[PDB]
Design a protein around this ligand. Structure first.
Ligand SMILES: *[C@@H](CC(=O)OC)C(=O)N(c1ccccc1)c1cncc(Cl)c1
Ligand SMILES: *[C@@H](CC(=O)OC)C(=O)N(c1ccccc1)c1cncc(Cl)c1
Lengths: 306, 306
């Protein structure tokens, strides 16, 4: 038993992290087969990141302007190209540690692991959710650009995020691995800001089920509610709507605990209207929304990856 | 910016996890050079784990009773011995992925990463603290026995924990890698229970400094307090005493934020006596005590590992 914010083992991704240097700019790259992927703003200087023309900036570069370090070993760049907001540096060596991988774009509400990296060297690993407003509440310092987020399915790494920037509220914005930003952000220095967020309702319900699985039951009650009547309450507390597909996705957790989904909604309703009155749920005094139904089943049932 | 419960990259440890089978019992082992380390209760059956004589049980085994699987490759056991509560299985192959490592025993209050494992296959990674009562609040299911906890210092893995059992309150107990239990627990089925816990005061102060570094300042005040007067308050809320060495360890964080340690203690005092009155600190509605001063400096400053 127990319940923790648990990331995927990071080793398959550690073997892909490299350091990319263009001029005085150093950040992280992702080395898969003979390609290194990195934020295109590596080609920008201080005054460039103001209002840059990336096509103009890139035509002025040569392969030799890109130094790629795989540990203490230098990779010769033999081609370069721009794909949306990412650079693709073709190198002469395929990475012998390339795992089986995919590039997948995730949905707000889904979770992933982040291997935070500096100078191509992994620093730490932690679990993140894509917020409804397409930001992530990460932990990133200067030089973390190019760190990636991912999920693992058996032996296959699904890369979903590459870190680009921090927004003024301290939250983080980035792209998928095709270079397409999550949300309405750009790789220039503007006054861009996050924009309003909501709480991921289906995830809170999953975490309440995780709590019941782990023996926290004080918040349960005999009442039920309808989906419409619950969604009226969710609106008022800035929770996003619950759909029938959410109810269906919560089916297995419902059947394992014997608590109907709509009964759990009644419990959530009471918690929103009354607070928790000095008690905790799974060691939190807040309603936690960064565990998906899958995360709960994975952790409370025990699936590994190889 | 941002602040997350962040584990060490796990790859150096992933390469050491193996599966150990004795009879019908399967658990995880740690393969370093030509030795596999695992809980000695692998040699016990259902009726054995009641009141076992491990020396009697082990003399009845042969090398061939131990099947060790390193992935889809079987390791031939060529010797076995007991060291306290762990088994040492000598195998004919040294692990080519052996990192530079040490066996270190940690103190209550210190943190480490856990690579949760099942059938020798890593499942997830997360950060844990050693509680003052020598338990850990982990996330472990049946079959996680033998999963290890560790820290990484540059390129060196300091192994500090091997998981053995879950206690009746859902918390976890285990040994260091010499087989010596943390706390007053035994690898038999008794009515053993955790015993009373306290909050790690110096860690809460470190996390308050992390919050200030990250722009949460609402809990700051102009008052100060003395070390004696603070420790009177800590006693009353089940916090453990703060010492002058704790104050010294908090020195760098004090100087970076310009908030005297004893001023932060005044803030903590106010938070204990008043609660947080609907506000949060670093996304928590509770005072968080599982970040050390080192964890805060590492994350808010950016040290990597290679
Ligand atoms: C990367 C900055 C870079 O490539 O130069 C070393 C970086 O990590 N940045 C960043 C992005 C945009 C503009 C300046 C700096 C970053 C990312 N996350 C958080 C923070 Cl504080 C900075
Ligand atoms: C390991 C049990 C084992 O070796 O048999 C497969 C295990 O993970 N155990 C455990 C320990 C002691 C007695 C029974 C089972 C365990 C550890 N942590 C949590 C839980 Cl729920 C069980």
């Amino acid at each position: 038993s127990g319940f923790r914010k648990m990331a995927f083992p990071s080793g398959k991704v550690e073997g892909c992290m490299v350091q990319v240097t263009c001029g005085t700019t150093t950040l992280n790259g992702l080395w898969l087969d003979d390609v290194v992927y990195c934020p295109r703003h590596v080609i920008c200087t201080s005054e460039d990141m103001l209002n840059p023309n990336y096509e103009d900036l890139l035509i002025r570069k040569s392969n030799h302007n890109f130094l790629v370090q795989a540990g203490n070993v230098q990779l010769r760049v033999i081609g370069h190209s721009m794909q949306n907001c990412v650079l693709k540096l073709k190198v002469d060596t395929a990475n012998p540690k390339t795992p089986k991988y995919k590039f997948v774009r995730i949905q707000p509400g889904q979770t992933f692991s982040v291997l935070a990296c500096y100078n191509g060297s992994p620093s730490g690993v932690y679990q993140c959710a894509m917020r409804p407003n397409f930001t992530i509440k990460g932990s990133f310092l200067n030089g973390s650009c190019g760190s990636v987020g991912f999920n693992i399915d058996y032996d296959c790494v699904s890369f979903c995020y590459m870190h680009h920037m921090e927004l003024p509220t301290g939250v983080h914005a980035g792209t998928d691995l095709e270079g397409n930003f999550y949300g309405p952000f750009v790789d220039r220095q503007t006054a861009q800001a996050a924009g309003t967020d909501t709480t991921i309702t289906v995830n809170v319900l999953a975490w309440l089920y995780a709590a019941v699985i782990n023996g926290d039951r004080w918040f349960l009650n005999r009442f039920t509610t309808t989906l419409n009547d619950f969604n009226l309450v969710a609106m008022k507390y800035n929770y996003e709507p619950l759909t029938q597909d959410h109810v269906d996705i919560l089916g297995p957790l419902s059947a394992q605990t014997g608590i109907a989904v709509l009964d759990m909604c009644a419990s959530l309703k009471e918690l929103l209207q009354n607070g928790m009155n000095g008690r905790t749920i799974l060691g939190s005094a807040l309603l936690e929304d960064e565990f998906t139904p899958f995360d709960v089943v994975r952790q409370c049932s025990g699936v590994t990856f190889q």
